[PDB]
Paper text:
PDZK1 is a multi-PDZ domain-containing adaptor protein known to play a role in the expression, localization and function of several cell surface receptors and ion channels. PDZK1 is a multi-PDZ domain containing protein, possessing four PDZ domains. PDZK1 was recently identified as a novel direct interactant of the IP and this interaction was determined to involve a Class I ‘PDZ ligand’ (Ser/Thr–X–Ф–COOH, where X represents any amino acid and Ф represents a hydrophobic amino acid) located at the extreme carboxyl terminus (-SLC386) of the human (h) IP. Prostacyclin primarily acts through the prostacyclin receptor or, in short, the IP, a member of the GPCR superfamily.
We grew crystals, collected X-ray diffraction data at the NSLS (Brookhaven National Laboratory) and solved the crystal structure at 1.70 Å resolution by molecular replacement using the coordinates of the crystal structure of the first PDZ domain of PDZK1 bound to the SR-BI carboxy-terminus as the search model. The high quality of the electron density map permitted unequivocal assignment of all amino acid side chains. Fig. 4B shows that in the crystal, the IP peptide (yellow) of one molecule (B) interacts with the peptide binding pocket of the PDZ domain (green) of an adjacent molecule (A) in the asymmetric unit, resulting in an “infinite chain” of head-to-tail molecules. As has been described for target peptide binding to other PDZ domains, the C-terminus of IP (−6IAACSLC 0) inserts into a groove formed between the β2 strand and the α2 helix, and the CBL formed by 14Lys… 20Tyr-21Gly-22Phe-23Phe-24Leu that connects the β1 and β2 strands. The backbone amides and carbonyls of the target peptide form classic anti-parallel β-sheet hydrogen bonding interactions beginning with carbonyl of 22Phe of the CBL and extending through β2 from 23Phe to 26Ile. The carboxylate group of the target peptide’s 0Cys makes hydrogen bonds with the amide nitrogens of 20Tyr, 21Gly and 22Phe in the CBL and, through water-mediated interactions, the carbonyls of 75Val and 76Arg of α2 and the carbonyl of 79Gly. 68His (α2), which did not participate in the SR-BI/PDZ1 interaction appears to play an important role in the IP/PDZ1 interaction, forming an hydrogen bond with the side chain of −2Ser. The crystal structure described herein, analyzing the interaction between the carboxy-terminus of the IP and PDZ1 highlights the plasticity of a given PDZ domain to interact with the carboxy-termini of binding targets with very different amino acid compositions: -IAACSLC for IP versus -VLQEAKL for SR-BI. The structure also highlights the importance of the last three carboxy-terminal amino acids of IP, responsible for the majority of hydrogen bonds formation and hydrophobic interactions between IP and PDZ1, a function that could not be assumed by a farnesyl group.
Author numbering: 5 to 113
The structure:
């Protein structure tokens, strides 16, 4: 499956509505527990998605704290490039260069 670009917006007094996790023996910055009615929910985030980029910044190899800090530094809007859990785990298995993944697609019909 393709990565997706999710554009989240929130107000002061709100959160985006998900947890970012590192899990034992699991690769990637994991999105977990999408809160009902949240910006994350509205923006198409899914449990098990990995965050590849935050506002264009490649974060797959960054430490958890630095990924969370980039979210904080983004303020009340943030663009996430995410990849679903199955596609991410297949990509790592297949030695796909995650840095080259982009949403741009174009086919002639």
């Amino acid at each position: 499956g393709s990565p997706r670009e999710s554009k989240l917006s929130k107000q002061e007094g709100q959160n985006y509505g998900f947890f970012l996790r590192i899990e034992k023996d699991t690769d990637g910055h994991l999105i977990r527990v999408i809160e009902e009615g949240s910006p994350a929910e509205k923006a198409g985030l899914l449990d098990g998605d990995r965050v590849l980029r935050i506002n264009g910044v490649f974060v797959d190899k960054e430490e958890h704290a630095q990924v969370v800090e980039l979210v904080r530094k983004s303020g009340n809007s943030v663009t996430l490039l995410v990849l679903d859990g199955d596609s991410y785990e297949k990509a790592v298995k297949n030695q796909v260069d995650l840095k080259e993944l982009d949403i741009a697609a174009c086919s002639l019909c």
